[PDB]
């Protein structure tokens, strides 16, 4: 506690745990956002700034080996560098004798001692202390309440399953009494006719039992996968309505894996909550009946169920651990496989094929070791429970024999008991095996729950920028003070040596992010008041990195705007200068194009992106260094597109090619995250302020 | 119809099926390389060339609507375009009456009518016929023999498992007669002391059973995972030594998925041979004892095992099918998901979030349909087999009772039989349930086997190119003709509007590919004859697409050459102009970059690729348009690199930036895959032939 779902968040998990021991239990996703959880990890500055943001007084200090401080403020946050992964930070709770017990956020509390610890620490420490508010953390709501809310509309069907279970088990007991009449009456008194009839009857009973189980199993399957679909859909829909910052924060694998996992686990939990109410009553009925058949034998059976429960409960936690380890290691194996294959060419050119080979041998070896651990745990479980069960059976038959020859019961009654055990111990075996699933279900429930909690958006002409500052993440601002003014229907230019900030400005205008301090205005009104759905359609962005989703081109070009006339589309297609590469397709306009396939070129692709921006009919068109993708055809199509534009709408050009930008109307300069001076090539070069230096260094040879 | 392992091969599977049904059984991998199976797919012209290569005299001709020619040459291969994917090709074997029997390459043979056929068919036909040679195909040997070869060092272990199993089951029968002695003597004749002692004893027997099964299960587990490791490792090793054409041919997901999955599936078969050799004998012993116990009851039991076998065997083929469907659908779902996520920004700007939302929802829905189908199959199976088993038990007990009151056996003996059943029926249940596993194991054996079959390599100064043509695949050739001459110890230049061909020449120069026609010459010897290892070490390429494998920088920089002095690495770092940002790192040189993380910049990355190219000490150095990728760091690093070259070794510059490349000594021009004129910037621009027009476009 508190365990970490992924690797991108760990310091967030450390601070989560420390806050949890200081009285603050808050959603770990929001802690990702407070720490500014990057794909790289959570910065130390992120942990300290998050602490300060929560009101906490925290100190981030370099540490000495060995400091071994007598008045050391617990808990402390220590960074670990050489721990298989890089975003690894561990909390220090207890340092007594010569053993530093480190509480690792990967669901662990180890005793590496200072010998191993000082061998594997960055030495970065964060002392954390409480500062007034809030000092309470009941915020994390139970999501399984909402998911049981998903269980609510299906009440008719789950009732049906309940009833079917009841009847099935009744018929089960009835059919289980066959042996008593068999051995005590039919074989001992030799009644052929009654034997035949009875046999037929109990056979029929069994057939009724299976004909019940058929529809019960059908029903529970249907219910289960419906819950699956519903939950998955809610998650996916809510992460689609989600703002950009979280998309930048986490990788694809994260959301995609956790979505599927949490869905299955939650469905398992709700099909299990179905199982609770039925197997409870069946275990009660069966237990009562077992008690009536024989008190002492029911006591024995109870001892068996108890021993089973003990073995399982004592075996649960380590198995989960070895499971997580198998997942992690096998994952690393698969990843190293993919990356080794992706770099097959360069790794061929190096001649170190043997290197990556030995690498994958080691990976396979470690995965094998972890696998052997989990497997060993499982066979231990099976062997112990098998012992308990088997010896349990022998004992029950033995004591049964005792009670038979003592004169307390008949052999047939014993055998009937040997048949009713299956109706007492099976329900309780399920009911006790239920606990591991519930834990994993809580884990998953939180996993999808925190993202289900996150806020959407909303809530939470001439173009001018006024005192607008911006930083992508909890770090040094990419854009400091920014003052700008752009004329409507005129081609302007944004130039900086930092394409990150240069493109950042354009991204900010599309309102995927908000200015930290101050506001940005278009045509006399601030972006904050403008509708996002209009900003999306009315502004078009031409990416340096073009993306193409699998499908027909005829569809892919017209995403967003449906039922668009072909007369409008074909002019844009012709204007993108890709039209030649459009008509060349096998299936004309509707050729299947899947994941940049089958034969998609970068140039034609960027041209197609331009075609999309055209088909979107933009009032404002922002262009990144798209021209750089395929130079010559880009020159032709850029001339063609600039001609088509007719300067009817505002067009912004972000580029590094000074020779290309000089022809433009006006130019802006980005230096060290601050705008310097606005103007044209002539006046700026004559300014001798810095642009003349830029041209001197460009012509520097 | 022959099922297809992957998606890149389908027409290859078609020709595989027709040739195999005609007497030509060849490795489908070799049929992929003959069809020139691209990542895109196998071309129709590829199918024709594969026909010619296999010896077939075939004509691939466009077809009309309901020609219904009486003398239509069977079999023929017709392609269907709609409605799920573009890579769909189908074999036609029988077209009679109003039922168009399509031999579907997805392990199917349907008789889909002309309504649906003409609703989704291209009408593209390839008439295939045997033409003279050869025809023979004995190449397809059973791979599971070679894979059975891996069991050899483990013979001791398998013997141990065998013995342990035998004793365990013997003890099992012994312990199974407990009920007999219980009811016939102890309960009927009322002996307490004997009861306690006997019970204790049989308990001990059970415990001995557990302490045997323990080590047995451990052993079989160890065996399994060792075979896994061995197979996986051999595959990976041989696919590392594998030529490039297949890497271009197949996707990463393909080779990797088939690697782990087919490996484990194949491993299952060697545990299956264990199950065969042990459960055969145990089912024999138990069956004999059961037969001696009671003839008629054993006959009943045999009927039960028979019914089980019938149900399972008749249920086998469709379950595998529904499995394939789940696989395909779930795959398409995951793909649409990932693709939906990667384009979150553009899909935000477009505003059609609801579009892809409804899309992925429909995908999830069809996946639900298939999944529910397989689930339905499974519950049908479970219910029927459960019927056979249950009714079997009730019947055995009633007829057993019948034989008890008839005077043929005792009740305790009946129960002994009812307890001994588990040692006749369990071994045979496993032995018959084994068959589905074996099929999938053979399939997988072929999946990894075909790639295990492909050959490695080998087999299969001044630099000049003479009449050398090259085409990557069975399509429009990238090089129709290339004539070039490069000066030793001089910085030359490669310019073309097509970066594909520009990089093609250099890649071909690295001898990763062989020239189709003509040869490539280096320093007086053809590249084909030069040792590919020396070509590997002596040539360094700075890629437009730089690759960095996860690990420490100190190692990642020095891949290939082991035991390289740190002075050379730090000098290469200094020369790469990245050294300053290298020492800025927290852990100096040994910082973990996994995977190319955490915060690596593009400029620094290309700089590192350049540093690696520096560390190889090239006699011939090939450079792609690294400058065009990242402007500013390219401006800084270009002066440093021009300073660095020192003209000691031959250096080749591939670039499109005309303004930048002219400073070099000589320049070459690539137009439409053909070389125009070799010379310098001055002579070419003054030539006014075409390079001057190019300069007019440069302005």
mmCIF file of N, CA and C in Angstrom, chain A residues 40 85-86 178 183 187 192 196 199 206 214 217 225 233 236-237 240-242 247 256 259 337-340 346 348-350 352-353 360-361 368 379-380 386 390-391 398 405 457 497 536 547 549-550 560 631-632 635 656 697, chain B residues 187 190 192 196 199 203 206 214 225 229 233 236 240 242 256 337-340 344 348-349 352-353 357 360-361 368 379-380 383 386 398 405 411 415 457 536 547 550 559-560 592 594-595 598-599 616 631-632 635 656 697 699:
data_model
loop_
_atom_site.group_PDB
_atom_site.id
_atom_site.type_symbol
_atom_site.label_atom_id
_atom_site.label_comp_id
_atom_site.label_asym_id
_atom_site.label_seq_id
_atom_site.Cartn_x
_atom_site.Cartn_y
_atom_site.Cartn_z
ATOM 1 N N UNK A 40 7.624 9.728 -18.838
ATOM 2 C CA UNK A 40 8.928 9.427 -18.264
ATOM 3 C C UNK A 40 8.778 8.948 -16.827
ATOM 4 N N UNK A 85 13.903 -0.573 -13.561
ATOM 5 C CA UNK A 85 13.203 0.529 -14.210
ATOM 6 C C UNK A 85 13.610 1.867 -13.601
ATOM 7 N N UNK A 86 13.335 2.939 -14.339
ATOM 8 C CA UNK A 86 13.876 4.262 -14.031
ATOM 9 C C UNK A 86 12.990 5.203 -13.221
ATOM 10 N N UNK A 178 -30.496 -41.476 -4.045
ATOM 11 C CA UNK A 178 -30.688 -42.735 -4.771
ATOM 12 C C UNK A 178 -29.971 -43.925 -4.139
ATOM 13 N N UNK A 183 -28.918 -49.423 -1.837
ATOM 14 C CA UNK A 183 -28.245 -50.393 -0.978
ATOM 15 C C UNK A 183 -29.081 -50.909 0.195
ATOM 16 N N UNK A 187 -31.317 -53.674 -3.123
ATOM 17 C CA UNK A 187 -30.391 -54.800 -3.234
ATOM 18 C C UNK A 187 -30.552 -55.787 -2.079
ATOM 19 N N UNK A 192 -36.831 -56.294 -8.054
ATOM 20 C CA UNK A 192 -36.421 -55.956 -9.411
ATOM 21 C C UNK A 192 -37.229 -54.809 -9.993
ATOM 22 N N UNK A 196 -35.899 -51.096 -11.049
ATOM 23 C CA UNK A 196 -35.994 -50.517 -12.383
ATOM 24 C C UNK A 196 -36.692 -49.161 -12.342
ATOM 25 N N UNK A 199 -34.686 -46.485 -10.498
ATOM 26 C CA UNK A 199 -33.558 -46.116 -11.349
ATOM 27 C C UNK A 199 -33.996 -45.138 -12.438
ATOM 28 N N UNK A 206 -32.151 -36.452 -12.761
ATOM 29 C CA UNK A 206 -30.871 -35.942 -13.244
ATOM 30 C C UNK A 206 -31.043 -35.185 -14.557
ATOM 31 N N UNK A 214 -28.634 -26.016 -18.199
ATOM 32 C CA UNK A 214 -28.443 -25.518 -19.556
ATOM 33 C C UNK A 214 -28.777 -24.030 -19.611
ATOM 34 N N UNK A 217 -26.774 -21.630 -17.220
ATOM 35 C CA UNK A 217 -25.446 -21.264 -17.716
ATOM 36 C C UNK A 217 -25.538 -20.293 -18.890
ATOM 37 N N UNK A 225 -21.503 -11.031 -20.179
ATOM 38 C CA UNK A 225 -20.897 -10.299 -21.290
ATOM 39 C C UNK A 225 -21.640 -8.988 -21.557
ATOM 40 N N UNK A 233 -18.016 0.245 -22.616
ATOM 41 C CA UNK A 233 -18.554 1.347 -23.389
ATOM 42 C C UNK A 233 -18.515 2.639 -22.599
ATOM 43 N N UNK A 236 -14.790 3.808 -22.424
ATOM 44 C CA UNK A 236 -14.322 4.291 -23.719
ATOM 45 C C UNK A 236 -14.942 5.637 -24.094
ATOM 46 N N UNK A 237 -16.247 5.752 -23.885
ATOM 47 C CA UNK A 237 -16.957 6.989 -24.168
ATOM 48 C C UNK A 237 -16.421 8.126 -23.311
ATOM 49 N N UNK A 240 -13.025 9.253 -24.359
ATOM 50 C CA UNK A 240 -13.100 9.993 -25.616
ATOM 51 C C UNK A 240 -13.470 11.458 -25.386
ATOM 52 N N UNK A 241 -14.352 11.703 -24.420
ATOM 53 C CA UNK A 241 -14.763 13.063 -24.077
ATOM 54 C C UNK A 241 -13.704 13.753 -23.217
ATOM 55 N N UNK A 242 -12.592 13.060 -23.003
ATOM 56 C CA UNK A 242 -11.550 13.499 -22.085
ATOM 57 C C UNK A 242 -10.585 14.492 -22.744
ATOM 58 N N UNK A 247 -4.123 12.412 -22.175
ATOM 59 C CA UNK A 247 -3.639 11.680 -23.343
ATOM 60 C C UNK A 247 -2.136 11.846 -23.518
ATOM 61 N N UNK A 256 -5.579 1.188 -22.882
ATOM 62 C CA UNK A 256 -6.148 0.066 -23.619
ATOM 63 C C UNK A 256 -6.119 -1.226 -22.798
ATOM 64 N N UNK A 259 -8.547 -0.741 -19.538
ATOM 65 C CA UNK A 259 -9.957 -0.757 -19.927
ATOM 66 C C UNK A 259 -10.489 -2.202 -19.978
ATOM 67 N N UNK A 337 11.381 -8.207 -27.555
ATOM 68 C CA UNK A 337 11.210 -8.909 -28.822
ATOM 69 C C UNK A 337 10.856 -7.910 -29.910
ATOM 70 N N UNK A 338 9.786 -7.153 -29.669
ATOM 71 C CA UNK A 338 9.299 -6.178 -30.641
ATOM 72 C C UNK A 338 10.355 -5.147 -31.009
ATOM 73 N N UNK A 339 11.016 -4.583 -30.004
ATOM 74 C CA UNK A 339 12.031 -3.569 -30.256
ATOM 75 C C UNK A 339 13.244 -4.160 -30.979
ATOM 76 N N UNK A 340 13.620 -5.390 -30.636
ATOM 77 C CA UNK A 340 14.725 -6.051 -31.329
ATOM 78 C C UNK A 340 14.386 -6.291 -32.798
ATOM 79 N N UNK A 346 19.418 -2.242 -38.272
ATOM 80 C CA UNK A 346 20.581 -1.632 -37.641
ATOM 81 C C UNK A 346 21.364 -2.659 -36.825
ATOM 82 N N UNK A 348 21.511 -5.719 -37.542
ATOM 83 C CA UNK A 348 22.198 -6.506 -38.563
ATOM 84 C C UNK A 348 23.469 -5.798 -39.027
ATOM 85 N N UNK A 349 23.377 -4.479 -39.169
ATOM 86 C CA UNK A 349 24.489 -3.664 -39.646
ATOM 87 C C UNK A 349 25.618 -3.610 -38.632
ATOM 88 N N UNK A 350 25.259 -3.656 -37.355
ATOM 89 C CA UNK A 350 26.246 -3.621 -36.287
ATOM 90 C C UNK A 350 27.030 -4.924 -36.221
ATOM 91 N N UNK A 352 26.096 -7.185 -34.112
ATOM 92 C CA UNK A 352 25.822 -7.649 -32.759
ATOM 93 C C UNK A 352 24.470 -8.335 -32.695
ATOM 94 N N UNK A 353 24.272 -9.289 -33.593
ATOM 95 C CA UNK A 353 23.063 -10.089 -33.622
ATOM 96 C C UNK A 353 23.140 -11.056 -32.446
ATOM 97 N N UNK A 360 17.879 -11.810 -25.392
ATOM 98 C CA UNK A 360 16.592 -12.499 -25.379
ATOM 99 C C UNK A 360 16.680 -13.860 -24.679
ATOM 100 N N UNK A 361 17.861 -14.481 -24.699
ATOM 101 C CA UNK A 361 18.051 -15.711 -23.936
ATOM 102 C C UNK A 361 17.886 -15.424 -22.458
ATOM 103 N N UNK A 368 11.148 -17.615 -17.358
ATOM 104 C CA UNK A 368 11.067 -19.018 -16.969
ATOM 105 C C UNK A 368 11.174 -19.177 -15.457
ATOM 106 N N UNK A 379 1.233 -25.685 -7.512
ATOM 107 C CA UNK A 379 1.283 -27.122 -7.262
ATOM 108 C C UNK A 379 1.339 -27.388 -5.756
ATOM 109 N N UNK A 380 1.959 -26.477 -5.006
ATOM 110 C CA UNK A 380 1.882 -26.540 -3.549
ATOM 111 C C UNK A 380 0.434 -26.474 -3.078
ATOM 112 N N UNK A 386 -5.447 -31.054 -1.935
ATOM 113 C CA UNK A 386 -5.706 -32.428 -2.325
ATOM 114 C C UNK A 386 -5.525 -33.387 -1.165
ATOM 115 N N UNK A 390 -8.657 -35.534 0.196
ATOM 116 C CA UNK A 390 -8.555 -36.984 0.164
ATOM 117 C C UNK A 390 -8.634 -37.633 1.534
ATOM 118 N N UNK A 391 -7.729 -37.226 2.421
ATOM 119 C CA UNK A 391 -7.728 -37.744 3.785
ATOM 120 C C UNK A 391 -9.062 -37.436 4.457
ATOM 121 N N UNK A 398 -14.463 -43.610 7.281
ATOM 122 C CA UNK A 398 -14.025 -44.379 8.445
ATOM 123 C C UNK A 398 -14.968 -44.163 9.631
ATOM 124 N N UNK A 405 -21.535 -49.572 12.340
ATOM 125 C CA UNK A 405 -21.477 -50.786 13.150
ATOM 126 C C UNK A 405 -21.793 -50.519 14.618
ATOM 127 N N UNK A 457 -14.399 18.047 -20.936
ATOM 128 C CA UNK A 457 -14.349 19.453 -21.322
ATOM 129 C C UNK A 457 -15.488 19.777 -22.287
ATOM 130 N N UNK A 497 13.741 28.794 -33.499
ATOM 131 C CA UNK A 497 14.602 27.627 -33.639
ATOM 132 C C UNK A 497 14.038 26.452 -32.847
ATOM 133 N N UNK A 536 -12.876 23.451 -33.123
ATOM 134 C CA UNK A 536 -12.394 22.237 -33.774
ATOM 135 C C UNK A 536 -12.601 22.283 -35.289
ATOM 136 N N UNK A 547 -1.442 11.384 -39.517
ATOM 137 C CA UNK A 547 -1.983 10.096 -39.086
ATOM 138 C C UNK A 547 -3.130 9.631 -39.990
ATOM 139 N N UNK A 549 -6.090 6.571 -40.292
ATOM 140 C CA UNK A 549 -6.772 5.410 -39.731
ATOM 141 C C UNK A 549 -7.212 4.447 -40.834
ATOM 142 N N UNK A 550 -7.214 3.156 -40.510
ATOM 143 C CA UNK A 550 -7.538 2.099 -41.461
ATOM 144 C C UNK A 550 -8.963 2.204 -41.992
ATOM 145 N N UNK A 560 -15.712 13.901 -39.715
ATOM 146 C CA UNK A 560 -16.216 15.131 -39.136
ATOM 147 C C UNK A 560 -17.483 15.570 -39.845
ATOM 148 N N UNK A 631 9.879 17.353 -50.217
ATOM 149 C CA UNK A 631 10.190 18.716 -50.662
ATOM 150 C C UNK A 631 9.579 19.204 -51.980
ATOM 151 N N UNK A 632 9.869 18.533 -53.092
ATOM 152 C CA UNK A 632 9.520 19.066 -54.414
ATOM 153 C C UNK A 632 8.014 19.088 -54.685
ATOM 154 N N UNK A 635 6.537 21.665 -52.822
ATOM 155 C CA UNK A 635 6.665 22.992 -53.411
ATOM 156 C C UNK A 635 5.558 23.223 -54.429
ATOM 157 N N UNK A 656 11.060 26.589 -40.593
ATOM 158 C CA UNK A 656 12.460 26.882 -40.333
ATOM 159 C C UNK A 656 13.147 27.427 -41.583
ATOM 160 N N UNK A 697 24.366 34.326 -39.414
ATOM 161 C CA UNK A 697 24.676 32.959 -39.001
ATOM 162 C C UNK A 697 24.111 31.913 -39.962
ATOM 163 N N UNK B 187 -17.862 -53.638 7.992
ATOM 164 C CA UNK B 187 -19.202 -53.214 8.388
ATOM 165 C C UNK B 187 -20.134 -54.410 8.580
ATOM 166 N N UNK B 190 -18.444 -56.540 11.469
ATOM 167 C CA UNK B 190 -18.299 -55.700 12.660
ATOM 168 C C UNK B 190 -16.963 -55.890 13.393
ATOM 169 N N UNK B 192 -13.932 -53.602 14.811
ATOM 170 C CA UNK B 192 -13.416 -52.255 15.108
ATOM 171 C C UNK B 192 -11.900 -52.094 14.948
ATOM 172 N N UNK B 196 -9.954 -49.630 12.283
ATOM 173 C CA UNK B 196 -8.996 -48.563 12.547
ATOM 174 C C UNK B 196 -7.677 -48.795 11.819
ATOM 175 N N UNK B 199 -8.080 -48.560 7.931
ATOM 176 C CA UNK B 199 -8.274 -47.164 7.540
ATOM 177 C C UNK B 199 -6.971 -46.369 7.596
ATOM 178 N N UNK B 203 -5.114 -44.728 4.341
ATOM 179 C CA UNK B 203 -4.739 -43.327 4.469
ATOM 180 C C UNK B 203 -3.271 -43.157 4.076
ATOM 181 N N UNK B 206 -2.788 -43.348 0.413
ATOM 182 C CA UNK B 206 -3.151 -42.076 -0.207
ATOM 183 C C UNK B 206 -2.043 -41.036 -0.077
ATOM 184 N N UNK B 214 3.485 -35.407 -6.433
ATOM 185 C CA UNK B 214 4.173 -34.140 -6.221
ATOM 186 C C UNK B 214 5.354 -34.012 -7.191
ATOM 187 N N UNK B 225 8.736 -26.620 -19.630
ATOM 188 C CA UNK B 225 9.317 -25.285 -19.758
ATOM 189 C C UNK B 225 10.715 -25.307 -20.394
ATOM 190 N N UNK B 229 11.698 -23.236 -23.775
ATOM 191 C CA UNK B 229 12.902 -22.411 -23.891
ATOM 192 C C UNK B 229 13.750 -22.797 -25.097
ATOM 193 N N UNK B 233 14.191 -20.436 -28.398
ATOM 194 C CA UNK B 233 15.549 -19.956 -28.618
ATOM 195 C C UNK B 233 16.076 -20.325 -30.001
ATOM 196 N N UNK B 236 14.269 -18.052 -32.568
ATOM 197 C CA UNK B 236 14.733 -16.669 -32.526
ATOM 198 C C UNK B 236 16.138 -16.543 -33.120
ATOM 199 N N UNK B 240 17.161 -14.507 -36.513
ATOM 200 C CA UNK B 240 18.150 -13.436 -36.457
ATOM 201 C C UNK B 240 19.144 -13.568 -37.611
ATOM 202 N N UNK B 242 18.404 -14.662 -40.390
ATOM 203 C CA UNK B 242 17.553 -14.724 -41.576
ATOM 204 C C UNK B 242 17.729 -13.486 -42.458
ATOM 205 N N UNK B 256 6.528 -12.538 -34.261
ATOM 206 C CA UNK B 256 6.596 -12.616 -32.801
ATOM 207 C C UNK B 256 5.458 -13.449 -32.186
ATOM 208 N N UNK B 337 -8.960 -0.046 -31.779
ATOM 209 C CA UNK B 337 -8.737 0.649 -30.513
ATOM 210 C C UNK B 337 -7.446 1.456 -30.519
ATOM 211 N N UNK B 338 -6.335 0.775 -30.794
ATOM 212 C CA UNK B 338 -5.018 1.408 -30.818
ATOM 213 C C UNK B 338 -5.000 2.550 -31.821
ATOM 214 N N UNK B 339 -5.550 2.281 -32.998
ATOM 215 C CA UNK B 339 -5.590 3.265 -34.065
ATOM 216 C C UNK B 339 -6.442 4.463 -33.659
ATOM 217 N N UNK B 340 -7.525 4.196 -32.939
ATOM 218 C CA UNK B 340 -8.378 5.258 -32.417
ATOM 219 C C UNK B 340 -7.652 6.124 -31.390
ATOM 220 N N UNK B 344 -5.857 10.614 -31.338
ATOM 221 C CA UNK B 344 -6.741 11.355 -30.440
ATOM 222 C C UNK B 344 -6.811 12.850 -30.751
ATOM 223 N N UNK B 348 -9.876 14.870 -32.253
ATOM 224 C CA UNK B 348 -10.403 15.986 -31.472
ATOM 225 C C UNK B 348 -10.672 17.193 -32.369
ATOM 226 N N UNK B 349 -9.761 17.446 -33.306
ATOM 227 C CA UNK B 349 -9.897 18.575 -34.221
ATOM 228 C C UNK B 349 -11.014 18.361 -35.239
ATOM 229 N N UNK B 352 -15.410 14.256 -35.021
ATOM 230 C CA UNK B 352 -16.109 12.992 -35.219
ATOM 231 C C UNK B 352 -15.658 11.935 -34.215
ATOM 232 N N UNK B 353 -15.719 12.273 -32.930
ATOM 233 C CA UNK B 353 -15.349 11.335 -31.874
ATOM 234 C C UNK B 353 -16.415 10.254 -31.750
ATOM 235 N N UNK B 357 -16.306 6.192 -32.008
ATOM 236 C CA UNK B 357 -16.920 5.592 -30.828
ATOM 237 C C UNK B 357 -17.938 4.526 -31.234
ATOM 238 N N UNK B 360 -15.996 1.472 -32.892
ATOM 239 C CA UNK B 360 -15.395 0.528 -31.963
ATOM 240 C C UNK B 360 -16.467 -0.194 -31.153
ATOM 241 N N UNK B 361 -17.605 0.462 -30.932
ATOM 242 C CA UNK B 361 -18.725 -0.213 -30.282
ATOM 243 C C UNK B 361 -19.271 -1.349 -31.139
ATOM 244 N N UNK B 368 -18.559 -9.786 -29.466
ATOM 245 C CA UNK B 368 -19.513 -10.402 -28.545
ATOM 246 C C UNK B 368 -20.296 -11.524 -29.213
ATOM 247 N N UNK B 379 -20.950 -24.834 -23.933
ATOM 248 C CA UNK B 379 -21.995 -25.291 -23.018
ATOM 249 C C UNK B 379 -22.791 -26.456 -23.616
ATOM 250 N N UNK B 380 -22.954 -26.469 -24.938
ATOM 251 C CA UNK B 380 -23.534 -27.641 -25.592
ATOM 252 C C UNK B 380 -22.697 -28.888 -25.314
ATOM 253 N N UNK B 383 -22.871 -29.947 -21.597
ATOM 254 C CA UNK B 383 -24.168 -30.505 -21.253
ATOM 255 C C UNK B 383 -24.332 -31.919 -21.791
ATOM 256 N N UNK B 386 -21.867 -34.276 -20.116
ATOM 257 C CA UNK B 386 -22.367 -34.393 -18.760
ATOM 258 C C UNK B 386 -23.528 -35.370 -18.695
ATOM 259 N N UNK B 398 -27.319 -48.994 -11.232
ATOM 260 C CA UNK B 398 -28.558 -49.770 -11.217
ATOM 261 C C UNK B 398 -28.320 -51.182 -11.760
ATOM 262 N N UNK B 405 -28.042 -58.465 -6.819
ATOM 263 C CA UNK B 405 -29.169 -59.284 -6.387
ATOM 264 C C UNK B 405 -29.290 -60.559 -7.215
ATOM 265 N N UNK B 411 -22.275 -56.017 -2.972
ATOM 266 C CA UNK B 411 -22.436 -54.574 -2.991
ATOM 267 C C UNK B 411 -21.127 -53.831 -2.806
ATOM 268 N N UNK B 415 -19.292 -51.242 -5.343
ATOM 269 C CA UNK B 415 -18.697 -49.959 -4.983
ATOM 270 C C UNK B 415 -17.215 -49.908 -5.323
ATOM 271 N N UNK B 457 22.078 -16.670 -44.362
ATOM 272 C CA UNK B 457 23.019 -16.058 -45.295
ATOM 273 C C UNK B 457 24.426 -15.969 -44.700
ATOM 274 N N UNK B 536 29.721 -5.589 -43.629
ATOM 275 C CA UNK B 536 28.978 -5.190 -42.437
ATOM 276 C C UNK B 536 29.779 -4.228 -41.563
ATOM 277 N N UNK B 547 17.413 3.927 -34.855
ATOM 278 C CA UNK B 547 16.929 2.957 -33.885
ATOM 279 C C UNK B 547 17.825 2.857 -32.658
ATOM 280 N N UNK B 550 16.747 -0.708 -25.989
ATOM 281 C CA UNK B 550 16.728 -0.388 -24.565
ATOM 282 C C UNK B 550 17.987 -0.858 -23.843
ATOM 283 N N UNK B 559 27.416 -1.019 -29.762
ATOM 284 C CA UNK B 559 26.924 -2.298 -30.267
ATOM 285 C C UNK B 559 27.712 -2.733 -31.500
ATOM 286 N N UNK B 560 27.916 -4.038 -31.632
ATOM 287 C CA UNK B 560 28.684 -4.575 -32.739
ATOM 288 C C UNK B 560 30.106 -4.903 -32.337
ATOM 289 N N UNK B 592 20.382 4.262 -18.190
ATOM 290 C CA UNK B 592 19.447 3.330 -18.810
ATOM 291 C C UNK B 592 18.534 4.068 -19.784
ATOM 292 N N UNK B 594 15.500 3.136 -21.624
ATOM 293 C CA UNK B 594 14.473 2.121 -21.826
ATOM 294 C C UNK B 594 13.074 2.720 -21.896
ATOM 295 N N UNK B 595 12.420 2.634 -23.051
ATOM 296 C CA UNK B 595 13.022 2.157 -24.288
ATOM 297 C C UNK B 595 13.282 3.372 -25.163
ATOM 298 N N UNK B 598 14.419 8.154 -20.867
ATOM 299 C CA UNK B 598 13.060 8.644 -20.663
ATOM 300 C C UNK B 598 12.722 9.896 -21.473
ATOM 301 N N UNK B 599 13.653 10.843 -21.514
ATOM 302 C CA UNK B 599 13.429 12.113 -22.196
ATOM 303 C C UNK B 599 14.443 12.390 -23.298
ATOM 304 N N UNK B 616 32.363 2.836 -35.620
ATOM 305 C CA UNK B 616 32.643 1.648 -36.430
ATOM 306 C C UNK B 616 33.917 1.769 -37.267
ATOM 307 N N UNK B 631 16.208 20.369 -38.225
ATOM 308 C CA UNK B 631 16.885 21.546 -38.771
ATOM 309 C C UNK B 631 18.056 22.136 -37.966
ATOM 310 N N UNK B 632 17.789 22.566 -36.736
ATOM 311 C CA UNK B 632 18.764 23.348 -35.974
ATOM 312 C C UNK B 632 19.994 22.542 -35.560
ATOM 313 N N UNK B 635 22.118 22.096 -38.393
ATOM 314 C CA UNK B 635 22.944 23.261 -38.701
ATOM 315 C C UNK B 635 24.189 23.286 -37.815
ATOM 316 N N UNK B 656 18.265 15.689 -50.303
ATOM 317 C CA UNK B 656 17.415 16.333 -51.291
ATOM 318 C C UNK B 656 17.650 17.835 -51.291
ATOM 319 N N UNK B 697 13.723 25.442 -60.171
ATOM 320 C CA UNK B 697 12.697 25.118 -59.187
ATOM 321 C C UNK B 697 13.179 25.429 -57.769
ATOM 322 N N UNK B 699 15.211 28.088 -57.132
ATOM 323 C CA UNK B 699 15.166 29.550 -57.098
ATOM 324 C C UNK B 699 16.247 30.117 -56.179
#
